[PDB]
């Protein structure tokens, strides 16, 4: 019935580098990938992020990778957008990763929003549909 992918309906890849998507509190997970040197892709982060601090820990928890290869540079970042250091995560390796790889992120910087069973229930998600989302 399930497979292992990066589209809506799919299985995430699970992430070895890290506490589960899978839960048995109804919790859901916005997973988004990120990196300094895609400036896009950092707007969007800031937005996200904020978004999330409008819901309790309990209904969703935001899971931010940079692929940025130095650490430094992930905490720099981190400390000048203000983000909550809770949810943002690096991944050292960068396109290197298996990670990278694994959520084709050569096609671009993309989220998903992971339900309670690990499954793909959005892609590229905003932070207005979100919201929309999380309150249905
Ligand atoms: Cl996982």
Known sequence: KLTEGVNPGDLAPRIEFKASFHNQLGRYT????????????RAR????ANEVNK???????????????????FTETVKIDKLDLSTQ????????????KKYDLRKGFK?????????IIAANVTPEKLTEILKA
Do not use: R, T
Request: glycine letters at 8%; proline letters at 2%; one cysteine or more.
């Open 55 to 73: 819901f309790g820990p309990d209904k969703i928890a935001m899971c931010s990778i940079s692929m940025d290869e130095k650490e430094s540079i």
């Open 89 to 100: 995560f690096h991944e050292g390796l960068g396109k290197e990763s298996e990670l990278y």
């Open 111 to 119: 989220n998903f929003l992971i339900n309670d069973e690990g499954v």
């Open 30 to 41: 916005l997973l988004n990938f990120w990196a300094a040197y895609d400036a896009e892709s």
């Open 45 to 48: 982060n800031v937005q996200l």
